[PDB]
Amino acid sequence: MEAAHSKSTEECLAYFGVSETTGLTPDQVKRHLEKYGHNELPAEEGKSLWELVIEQFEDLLVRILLLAACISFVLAWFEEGEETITAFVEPFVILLILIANAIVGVWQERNAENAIEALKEYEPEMGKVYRADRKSVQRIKARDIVPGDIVEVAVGDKVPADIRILSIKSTTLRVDQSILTGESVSVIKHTEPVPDPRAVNQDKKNMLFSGTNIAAGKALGIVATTGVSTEIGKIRDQMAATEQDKTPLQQKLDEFGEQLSKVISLICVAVWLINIGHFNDPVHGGSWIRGAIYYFKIAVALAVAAIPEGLPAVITTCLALGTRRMAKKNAIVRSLPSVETLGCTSVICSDKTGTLTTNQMSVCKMFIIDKVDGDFCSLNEFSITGSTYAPEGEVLKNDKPIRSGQFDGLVELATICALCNDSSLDFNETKGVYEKVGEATETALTTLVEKMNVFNTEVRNLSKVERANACNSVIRQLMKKEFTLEFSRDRKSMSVYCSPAKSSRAAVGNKMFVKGAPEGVIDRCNYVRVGTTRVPMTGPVKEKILSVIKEWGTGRDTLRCLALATRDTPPKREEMVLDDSSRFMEYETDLTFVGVVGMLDPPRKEVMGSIQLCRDAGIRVIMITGDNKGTAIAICRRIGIFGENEEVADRAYTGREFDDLPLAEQREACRRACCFARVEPSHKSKIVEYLQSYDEITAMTGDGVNDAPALKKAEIGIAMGSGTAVAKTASEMVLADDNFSTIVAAVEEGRAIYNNMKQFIRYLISSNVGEVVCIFLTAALGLPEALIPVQLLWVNLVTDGLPATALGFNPPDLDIMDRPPRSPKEPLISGWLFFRYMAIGGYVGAATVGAAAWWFMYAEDGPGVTYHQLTHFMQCTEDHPHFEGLDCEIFEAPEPMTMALSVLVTIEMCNALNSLSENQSLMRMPPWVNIWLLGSICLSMSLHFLILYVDPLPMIFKLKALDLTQWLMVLKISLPVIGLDEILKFIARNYLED
Ligand SMILES: Nc1ncnc2c1ncn2[C@@H]1O[C@H](COP(=O)(O)OP(=O)(O)CP(=O)(O)O)[C@@H](O)[C@H]1O
Ligand SMILES: CC(=O)C1=C(O)N2[C@H](C1=O)[C@H]1c3c[nH]c4cccc(c34)C[C@H]1C2(C)C
Ligand SMILES: [K+]
Ligand SMILES: [Mg+2]
Numbered sequence: 001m002e003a004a005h006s007k008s009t010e011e012c013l014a015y016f017g018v019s020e021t022t023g024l025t026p027d028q029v030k031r032h033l034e035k036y037g038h039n040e041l042p043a044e045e046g047k048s049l050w051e052l053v054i055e056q057f058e059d060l061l062v063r064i065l066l067l068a069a070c071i072s073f074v075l076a077w078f079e080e081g082e083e084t085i086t087a088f089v090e091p092f093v094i095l096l097i098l099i100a101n102a103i104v105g106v107w108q109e110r111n112a113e114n115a116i117e118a119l120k121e122y123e124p125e126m127g128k129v130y131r132a133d134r135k136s137v138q139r140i141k142a143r144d145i146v147p148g149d150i151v152e153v154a155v156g157d158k159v160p161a162d163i164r165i166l167s168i169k170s171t172t173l174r175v176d177q178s179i180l181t182g183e184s185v186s187v188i189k190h191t192e193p194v195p196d197p198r199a200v201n202q203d204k205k206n207m208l209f210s211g212t213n214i215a216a217g218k219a220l221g222i223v224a225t226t227g228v229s230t231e232i233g234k235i236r237d238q239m240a241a242t243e244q245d246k247t248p249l250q251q252k253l254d255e256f257g258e259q260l261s262k263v264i265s266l267i268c269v270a271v272w273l274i275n276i277g278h279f280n281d282p283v284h285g286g287s288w289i290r291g292a293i294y295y296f297k298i299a300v301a302l303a304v305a306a307i308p309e310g311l312p313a314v315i316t317t318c319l320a321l322g323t324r325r326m327a328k329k330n331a332i333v334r335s336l337p338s339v340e341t342l343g344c345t346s347v348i349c350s351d352k353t354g355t356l357t358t359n360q361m362s363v364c365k366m367f368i369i370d371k372v373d374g375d376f377c378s379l380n381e382f383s384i385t386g387s388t389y390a391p392e393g394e395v396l397k398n399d400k401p402i403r404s405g406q407f408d409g410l411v412e413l414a415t416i417c418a419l420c421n422d423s424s425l426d427f428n429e430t431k432g433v434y435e436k437v438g439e440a441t442e443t444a445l446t447t448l449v450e451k452m453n454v455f456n457t458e459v460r461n462l463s464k465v466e467r468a469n470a471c472n473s474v475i476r477q478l479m480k481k482e483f484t485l486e487f488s489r490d491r492k493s494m495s496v497y498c499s500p501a502k503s504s505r506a507a508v509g510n511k512m513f514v515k516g517a518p519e520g521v522i523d524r525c526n527y528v529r530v531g532t533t534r535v536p537m538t539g540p541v542k543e544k545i546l547s548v549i550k551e552w553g554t555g556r557d558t559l560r561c562l563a564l565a566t567r568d569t570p571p572k573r574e575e576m577v578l579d580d581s582s583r584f585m586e587y588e589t590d591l592t593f594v595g596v597v598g599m600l601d602p603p604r605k606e607v608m609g610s611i612q613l614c615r616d617a618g619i620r621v622i623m624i625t626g627d628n629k630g631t632a633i634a635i636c637r638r639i640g641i642f643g644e645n646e647e648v649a650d651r652a653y654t655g656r657e658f659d660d661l662p663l664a665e666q667r668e669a670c671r672r673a674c675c676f677a678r679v680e681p682s683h684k685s686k687i688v689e690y691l692q693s694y695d696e697i698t699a700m701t702g703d704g705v706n707d708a709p710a711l712k713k714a715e716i717g718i719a720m721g722s723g724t725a726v727a728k729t730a731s732e733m734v735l736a737d738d739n740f741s742t743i744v745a746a747v748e749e750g751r752a753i754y755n756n757m758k759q760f761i762r763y764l765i766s767s768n769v770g771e772v773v774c775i776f777l778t779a780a781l782g783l784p785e786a787l788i789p790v791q792l793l794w795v796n797l798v799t800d801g802l803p804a805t806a807l808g809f810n811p812p813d814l815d816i817m818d819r820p821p822r823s824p825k826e827p828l829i830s831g832w833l834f835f836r837y838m839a840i841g842g843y844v845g846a847a848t849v850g851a852a853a854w855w856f857m858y859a860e861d862g863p864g865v866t867y868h869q870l871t872h873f874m875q876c877t878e879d880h881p882h883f884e885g886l887d888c889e890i891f892e893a894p895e896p897m898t899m900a901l902s903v904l905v906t907i908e909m910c911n912a913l914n915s916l917s918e919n920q921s922l923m924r925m926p927p928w929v930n931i932w933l934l935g936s937i938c939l940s941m942s943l944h945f946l947i948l949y950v951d952p953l954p955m956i957f958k959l960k961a962l963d964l965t966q967w968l969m970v971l972k973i974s975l976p977v978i979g980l981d982e983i984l985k986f987i988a989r990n991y992l993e994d
């Protein structure tokens, strides 16, 4: 059944053809269960660890290193009776890396807790119905409720389905709809049509929404919809639309996967063309068994050389450490990549209530009457400080603290606030904070009474649990509450009838204390309290008081105001009927106006300063709230999203006003406007989606179930520590201490992290370039491979491993938070920078083949000088007469490859220093800046020396140690890589773009 809110109750009943005092028949229920299905949300799984690891071995690039694992496996199985001892280390070191990178890949991408399961917390197991087969209510499984059911809800119930209210049995039905609005103040419901077809949930005052709850009262309704066709079901579906997105760089990674996987395929057929180059002269002395095996040997060496294994490890380590830093600021990152994603953020969308604000309703202004001089009427206004339910703050007069008990009118105001009240305050010993018990707007009065302390009660030595209601209890000892005239919609006030406690002295006679909406309470006042005296309420006085109250309700203030009054001479108890709320208004007449309190849900102290720092970093903040527009704008002004006098006609929209714009204008509104109010959970994700469609990297901050869709949709969702479990499980990061400042800190950390990542990725990839150049040089020319996979794997994983991780510890810049966010489209290399280490890469790729082949010809030991014969080792077994004065095995010596490896290691270690900075020469930026880079290289070097000098190590890696002349040759053939890039820095800091 659609449009339940605009149908009358008779139309809803007639739709299902049911009586309100009968309900559906059990057969009808059976048919509706068939037709509509059960009243429940589908569970959303999320793949076993099985189908996750499987997906790690799916993206193209990973297969390349699996191909070179299986080929490596075969070309190590059918190994001759020679070294089948360690031939299997290669297909295992590889096969190990692919295992390690998978387990890590899942340990960062997997979201443990499920947000749809948290949502189901709002699904009550049980609901209550009237069905035709019984007169009395029937308590059944909620999932068995169907459209058409007559349902009964009552105080404390979770609402089981979307329900048109038919009949309110209590005097009011008060509903907490925070899961759809973020707002915890009760909604007073009625049963009349809401004619607007586009009514937003905050308008549907005749509906009950599944998953909300009844703060008070009792009602009967008819179920309009169940299952996913409900408001909470819509939230569930937007969370189920699981896009499983990815960090900008993580999309660059996924991108570079496609990049490198083709580069290899092209290079492999390119090696093949130069392998097929001397295919026209193989003299068939070794058939093709040698040829088709030497070629795969090359492929495994090329694939290994191209793929920068260890990169997944250095990143994960960088991210993980980042997460450790944020944890010390009380930011719990639940997804590793997210710690960095925040750095690229250009727009931060924010819930207001409980996010920007404390979600703790606070009386911040009050007044009583000081004097009435005929027509003129002087008010005594006070402000009250403090922004939580904690009874901490003071009452101020002209910004100076005063003792509330000084003023008789405040004693009376406090008395009414304490007594005309169904709530209290409680100190939660487990959470360490004060919490309301009952309605927010009532607990605000309770908190006020505690701050006012009109009797100067000693409260400093109380435990926090006792302190919670101390000053209210002292008022209870004076006046005894005898009964309550509860709130009704017709009069918009409530009152309590009180007698002075035994042993009076206070004052003789019974009293009625009244609070309510200003206009109706004031209309029923014939007198005004001035101190302890009472004077006639006149027109001009009534007008002055109403005017000030109206200013308080619409200002830069926009406060909820209550008027407080007492009936000085109440009827005798016996003259009042309590079972009929229609009579209550009349009982609350001939009142004496006492005062007014104005409350709001106020900003967290750090929010204003945080918005400013965001603004200084080129980040826009947009408030997106379920709350009304007036309040939303007023808070925006207090927190500096808008200027205090800024005109916001086209900068602030309700969800409806936003919906009314042409689709094009809706997109532009999202760039111009900074406050969206009276919004549904869908509006928030819609706005985030528009923002993202300008390619803005966008964040969402929230605490509520109604923020869950936007939290999921945003690149980065951020939840408040004290907010809902649903919002937390929908987020990438949680601010455990609710400190909004931490977001600003997380952006800086994320920018620092991004800078270090991009450059340690360059450092690690400049390496993989030279290797490929090498594995191609010593292949095309017909040379004995200067490096083989098992050595390359050590370098990429370990030798370059440490230094890369060292660069992820470089100091962040000083202006890091004074630049605008970087563009998401920004590559990782551009023009100058690409050819920059294609030059450095052209050097390592040559100097390695160049120092290995050096050991042949122009070196001492030194088989050696063969020249053109070196580029023809395939015919030493066959065409031996050519190779006279030499053996036919010394072409497979460990020394020349040790020369090659020692060059690579030495070049990359130097290449780590020039990686400390992008443009600043080592002259102007010392190599002693990042000490941890020094310890990192000295480790890599001492590890290099190791595999050269430990009995097993050089056999598994095919190395043989170098003389001190074999190292002088290495240094004089590697160290120039510094001066090369160093001059590449001089030709970039001046004549390029500096
Ligand atoms: N328990 C209570 N005792 C006294 N006064 C109460 C009260 N609960 C609410 N009120 C007062 O009466 C008014 C009744 O609220 P109501 O149901 O009219 O909603 P609202 O006017 O705040 C709704 P909306 O923002 O959706 O238009 C409140 O604004 C408040 O001043
Ligand atoms: C088994 C497993 O999950 C993985 C791997 O085994 N790896 C990475 C990877 O994710 C591979 C990868 C994909 N996209 C990129 C971009 C840059 C670098 C890497 C990758 C390293 C790749 C490899 C093969 C080490
Ligand atoms: K998200
Ligand atoms: Mg909220």
Ligand SMILES: [Mn+2]
Binding pocket: 056, 057, 062, 101, 102, 105
């Ligand atoms: Mn992977």
Ligand SMILES: [Mn+2]
Binding pocket: none
């Ligand atoms: Mn109302």
